[PDB]
């Protein structure tokens, strides 16, 4: 008797808030169905899991530098002098049922967040989804990326182990006291004295759990609101114009897909956090100034910054009894890639002199210069990332450690140019690949062997034919083209039935008839709509 | 008060069509499995989330002169071995130099 139950609780809501038209509008919103548009939500689904795991790791952690003696369950560190933060981090992993699993899922989700953001950024850049009126959204996303990087960096510095301590001494302390005028003032303001201090871990904890996630949440909210009210772009195709959206309604197709995708992302993250080990802090020790190991690697989203330090030469200046260290060059450099990233749309708008309120995307093959620039940037990023782990590559692969530095140093000026050239040529060649099929047709891969001994290939025209049998040339419309005959339906179903036993013939015939008729109806509907639009 | 009849009728038709067109109600087997599976997953997840900070308060952890005993049964005055001498000490000050004397 749920018909009477739902009819009563529906009237109670409409008589008090009257949200009929307002929710009816939201149930009818149309969203394009392209795989590439699912890249953005993964990050979102990664953020939520980072919040649930962040609340479960807030019931057991104690951020303090007060030095203690362990005397716990883990025997190899029995009697060692550590801090309260490190001891509590060991307690989470060894004394609480399922704590190791939770913190492993936390770290894995942290990695997925950054990876997803990078892929989403690549998608947005390459398809020209930033042009107009979607510049502010690009800017917001850029700020989100920067905040995500710094949020991640402050996270693994909390356990206060040897790796994180060595990283934070070199990055946050060494670089800080190199800035020309405000070098030592800023250092003493941040640390409240010399490097180790007694307030750094509490400050980082308060910064990591409260402030940066709050700013991230606000910015994400703004991002999603802008996307919702600016009517997501689409791609060129049959029935697509500058002033419409083609896809499916929110209720019920879109919501089910979103829920299923969230479930599968959660499944993958949970499965990955049990079978693979990440961040074993017990194999390390408590941070000591007079101790170090061989690796010394930050997380992959911070690797390019560390690799830039390793490759830049030792150039310093000494004016009037002062010092300008090497570390300055990176601090200027690091903030120069950011500035060039946020204000890219304006640069391109000024260069090409185009601002015409675009709603239709671009295929990367159609814009060679932008594609080449993106490829060059990706190449530089990859080289800087692989330069940070030049000591691990030199060990596992037999190559000199001195040789890797020079390889990277020379490469960071040579490899981008090669990538630019190759990308440009490749894009133009992919363009030329499309003009061959609009003019001659799809090559079926069949040879004919005419009576007089000539070999020809059978082509399948994509449009009307001429009186001589040669196809009428078609125009390019910014849409993909078929290149295989199997994708055009040159192949039926093997037969209705199970994997081992067939079904009665009549069922198979009826099902084939229905499917074929449904395909006719869909194509006809699209064609009719496209014909009525352009009258 | 109440939104016009047109909005109410259209929104109700939309929701009803979404539910009815899915043909979910006609399929009892898969509609029941979904509920059972979701319930099982929820129960497992909730027990895993909460079961980490539950401790037994009646477990013997305190060494005494009569074996290990629970915390609430013991104090600083319980003998640890037979014939142990426990003094009544006063506290005055001197945080680092004998805060307790006979």
């Amino acid at each position: 008797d749920f018909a009477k139950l739902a009819a009563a609780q529906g009237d109670a809501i409409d008589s008090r808030y009257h949200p009929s038209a307002a929710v009816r509008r939201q149930l009818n919103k149309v969203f394009p169905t392209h795989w590439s548009f699912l890249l953005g939500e993964i990050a979102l689904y990664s953020f939520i899991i980072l919040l649930l795991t962040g609340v479960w790791l807030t019931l057991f952690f104690d951020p303090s530098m007060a030095h203690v003696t362990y005397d716990g369950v883990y025997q190899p560190l029995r009697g060692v002098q550590m801090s309260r933060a490190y001891e509590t981090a060991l307690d989470i992993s060894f004394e609480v049922r399922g704590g190791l699993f939770v913190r492993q899922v936390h770290h894995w989700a942290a990695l997925m967040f950054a990876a997803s953001i990078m892929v989403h950024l690549a998608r947005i850049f390459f398809t020209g989804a930033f042009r107009r009126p979607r510049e502010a959204n690009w800017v917001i996303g850029s700020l989100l990326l920067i905040l995500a990087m710094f949020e991640g960096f402050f996270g693994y510095s909390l356990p206060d182990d040897l790796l994180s301590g060595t990283g934070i001494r070199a990055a946050l302390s060494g670089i800080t006291m190199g800035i020309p005028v405000i070098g030592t003032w800023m250092h003493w303001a941040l640390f409240g004295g010399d490097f180790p201090g007694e307030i750094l871990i509490p400050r980082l904890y308060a910064l990591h759990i409260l402030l940066i996630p709050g700013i991230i949440l606000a910015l994400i909210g703004a991002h999603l609101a802008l996307v919702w009210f600016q009517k997501h772009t689409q791609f060129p195709g049959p029935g697509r114009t500058e002033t419409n959206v083609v896809g499916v309604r929110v209720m019920p197709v879109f919501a089910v897909k979103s829920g299923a995708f969230f479930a599968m992302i959660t499944g993958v993250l949970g499965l990955m956090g049990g079978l693979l080990t990440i961040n074993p802090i017990w194999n390390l020790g408590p941070y000591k100034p007079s101790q170090v190991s061989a690796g010394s690697q930050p997380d992959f989203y911070m690797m390019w910054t560390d690799g830039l330090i390793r490759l830049w030469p030792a150039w310093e200046f000494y004016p009037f009894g002062h010092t300008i260290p090497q570390g300055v060059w990176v601090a200027v450099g690091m903030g120069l890639v950011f500035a060039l990233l946020i204000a890219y749309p304006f640069i391109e708008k000024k260069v090409t002199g185009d601002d015409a309120h675009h709603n239709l995307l671009q295929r990367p093959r159609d814009v060679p210069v932008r594609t080449a620039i993106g490829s060059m940037a990706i190449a530089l990023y990859l080289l800087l990332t692989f330069a940070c782990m030049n000591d691990i590559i030199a060990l596992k692969f037999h190559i000199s450690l001195n040789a890797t530095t020079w390889i990277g140093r020379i490469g960071m000026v040579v490899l981008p140019a090669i990538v630019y050239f190759v990308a440009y040529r490749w894009a133009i060649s992919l363009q030329r690949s499309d003009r061959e099929v609009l003019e001659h047709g799809v090559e079926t891969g069949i040879i004919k062997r005419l009576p007089h001994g000539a070999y020809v290939e059978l082509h399948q025209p994509l449009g009307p034919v001429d009186e001589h049998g040669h196809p009428i040339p078609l125009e390019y419309a910014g849409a993909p083209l078929p290149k295989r005959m199997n994708k055009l339906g040159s192949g039926g179903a093997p037969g209705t039935g199970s994997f081992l036993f067939p079904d009665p013939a009549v069922e198979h015939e009826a099902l084939t008839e229905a499917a074929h008729a449904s395909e006719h109806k869909s194509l006809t509907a699209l064609k009719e709509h496209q014909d009525r639009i352009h009258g | 008060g109440r939104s016009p009849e047109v909005h109410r009728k259209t929104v109700a038709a939309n929701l009803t069509d979404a539910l009815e067109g899915s043909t979910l109600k006609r399929r009892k087997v898969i509609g029941l499995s979904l509920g059972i599976g979701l319930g099982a997953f929820g129960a497992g997840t909730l027990v895993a989330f909460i079961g980490g900070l539950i401790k037994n308060p009646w477990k013997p952890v305190v060494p005494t002169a009569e074996g290990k005993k629970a915390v609430l049964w013991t104090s600083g005055w319980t003998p640890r071995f037979k014939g142990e001498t426990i003094y009544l000490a006063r506290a005055t000050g001197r945080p680092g130099e004998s805060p307790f004397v006979k």
């Binding site: 009816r24 | 047109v6 038709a13 069509d17």
Partner: peptide, 24 residues
């Protein structure tokens, strides 16, 4: 602008059409 009399004379099929047409 259908009246209250006509809205009771429509099936579930054409009410969804009307809602969609209102929303665009």
């Amino acid at each position: 602008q259908p009246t209250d009399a006509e809205l009771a004379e429509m099936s579930r099929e054409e009410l969804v059409k009307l809602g969609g047409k209102i929303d665009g």
